[PDB]
């Protein structure tokens, strides 16, 4: 009759236009319509790209990384087909994250000697924690087991950054910067030179070279090369081949650093952020106007902005083209804790048991969530899809699309929540029970 297989009949591009108007549910159904619809749908890299983006499983400027990881996981598969399985897997995992009936698998691992964890890294199937007991603990997140304790620091560990390849850098009250190999299980290098506690640190990569930037209670940052090719001890920066130089400008302790490429931003107890070019070893900007200590900063490289949070109770967004103040966010209750920038949201905790989210681009108000107890937030982690937050006796998970608490129940038995991090199916928490620390691995497969 007057019936026609329009998808088939139409030029290929017109058919993708059509398919790109549809929800993914309709696309899965279309796959099952016939061989020809199947081929058509499976031919398009950009159909699956758009899908992955519209569900926020990835961002445009995050995509090459995902593509590579897929060609590694699935080398016998085509780009299109890799993207599709990635999409289908992510939806499954997300649906579970979203369903208040779903109960993840819980694994508990002995934590540290001291009952307070200070820092937590979750990367490449490794969970790393540091604490006041002078120890770094490496766990395996697939097999969910304790791999090993790295000791040697003479004080508490205040900061750690994992770098690709089982490499770790930590900073300590012992004023050393240490570099570790996990697979080998030891300190490879000690870098002396700070005259006071190493309080914060980041790792940046520029023209294919990796650098450690460390901020200290001594007022300065020091820049070092991440070593490539036991422990080799360097007592004298002058004679240390991995030592680049010192960044001087702050008049008090450097609490917080955030870099990308050759640009690094630090905030100080002097009330100031400095922006530095790390290849010229120069100050670019002093950022003035906060009226009390700065405790958190994010250098937003995509947008060329700085975000800072201060004890003065404000957040400021600064424009890195001209060193100018853009926006001041406030107020009514102090901010606390570390800030986060997902692709959609700038998020911070507040001194009233809430987490607040602003749009990452124009900083309009997007969400507030409250621990019903007015319980001081200790930690949260976010992405465009999920907020996870902890405080005393409380561990909440929220669905940021629907704005609803999805799970309040999951780690009830834990007294304190020190640190929380998640990626796909895995969620990890550094916690305290009955005056003792544990590592919790929650899995949403």
């Amino acid at each position: 009759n007057l019936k026609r297989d329009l998808i088939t009949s139409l030029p290929f591009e017109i058919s993708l236009k059509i398919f790109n108007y549809l929800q993914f549910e309709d696309i899965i159904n279309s796959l099952g319509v016939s061989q020809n619809w199947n081929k058509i749908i499976r031919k398009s890299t950009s159909l699956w790209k758009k899908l992955l983006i519209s569900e926020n499983f990835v961002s445009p400027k995050g995509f090459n990384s995902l593509n590579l990881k897929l060609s590694q996981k699935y080398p016998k598969l085509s780009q299109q087909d890799r993207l599709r399985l990635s999409f289908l897997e992510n939806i499954f995992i997300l649906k579970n994250w979203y369903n208040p009936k779903f109960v993840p698998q819980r694994t508990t691992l002995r934590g540290h000697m001291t009952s307070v964890i200070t820092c937590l890294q979750f990367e490449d199937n490794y969970v790393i924690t540091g604490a006041d007991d002078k120890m770094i603990r490496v766990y395996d997140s697939i097999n969910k087991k304790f791999l090993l304790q790295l000791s040697g620091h003479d004080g508490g560990v205040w900061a750690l950054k994992y770098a690709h390849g089982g490499i770790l850098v930590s900073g300590s009250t012992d004023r050393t910067v240490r570099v570790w190999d996990i697979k080998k299980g030891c300190c490879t290098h000690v870098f002396e030179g700070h005259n006071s506690t190493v309080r914060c640190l980041d790792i940046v990569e520029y023209k294919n070279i990796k650098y450690i930037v460390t901020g200290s209670r001594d007022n300065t940052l020091h820049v070092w090369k991440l070593p490539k090719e036991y422990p080799l001890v360097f007592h004298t920066p002058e004679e240390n081949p991995y030592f680049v130089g010192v960044l001087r400008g702050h008049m008090a302790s450097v609490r917080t650093v955030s870099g990308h490429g050759n640009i690094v931003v630090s905030g100080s107890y002097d009330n100031t952020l400095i922006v530095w070019d790390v290849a010229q070893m120069k100050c670019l900007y002093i950022l003035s106007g906060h009226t009390d200590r700065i405790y958190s900063t994010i250098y937003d490289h995509e947008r060329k902005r700085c975000i800072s949070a201060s004890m003065d109770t404000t957040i400021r967004i600064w424009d890195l083209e001209n060193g100018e103040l853009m926006y001041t966010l406030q107020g009514h209750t102090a901010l606390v804790g570390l800030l986060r920038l997902s692709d959609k949201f700038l998020v911070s905790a507040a001194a009233d048991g809430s987490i607040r989210g602003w749009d990452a681009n124009d900083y309009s108000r997007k969400f507030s969530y409250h621990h019903t107890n007015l319980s001081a937030i200790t930690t949260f982690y976010v992405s465009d899809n999920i907020l996870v937050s902890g405080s005393e006796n409380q561990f909440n998970i929220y669905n940021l699309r629907s704005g609803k608490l999805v799970h309040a129940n999951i780690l009830k038995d834990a007294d304190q929540i020190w640190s929380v991090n998640f990626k796909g199916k895995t969620l990890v928490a550094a916690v305290e029970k009955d005056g003792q620390s544990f590592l919790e691995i929650l899995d949403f497969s």
Binding site: L2, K3, K17, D26, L31, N36
Partner: protein
């Protein structure tokens, strides 16, 4: 100021030049009479009816007078999409594609097939591998 568009059947359609310019092919061309190969008169007339009705529309989501207008049989719809594509009128092509999508939305593969008269040509193997 007018222009003539000749359909694939030889029929000349006089249209206001400003209005016909909605087609960027026509706007491009170049440079009183423009051929429109392989587009039946009733289809061309449909297109021009769209362009004349949207004469004052600002294009930069869904549609409404376009829904009666695109509520035709499948042959027609198809043919209107081809002509929009050929003539480069994004908002109409966009509009027709949206309409095709409205046919598929929330329907199972069984219904999609029945709607378009498509044969299920999977082997029982192809299909087992499909439901997972």
């Amino acid at each position: 100021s007018n222009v003539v568009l000749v359909s694939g059947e030889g029929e000349r359609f006089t249209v206001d030049k400003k209005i016909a310019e909605r087609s960027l092919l026509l706007k491009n061309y170049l440079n009183i009479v423009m051929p429109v190969p392989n587009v039946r008169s009733s289809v061309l007339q449909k297109v021009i009816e769209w362009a004349e009705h949207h004469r004052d529309s600002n294009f930069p989501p869904v549609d409404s007078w376009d829904r009666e207008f695109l509520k035709v049989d499948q042959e027609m719809l198809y043919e209107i999409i081809l002509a929009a594509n050929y003539l480069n009128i994004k908002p109409l092509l966009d509009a027709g594609c949206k309409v095709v999508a409205e046919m598929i939305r929330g329907r199972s593969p069984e219904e999609i097939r029945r709607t378009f008269n498509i044969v299920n040509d999977f082997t029982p193997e192809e299909e087992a591998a499909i439901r997972r």
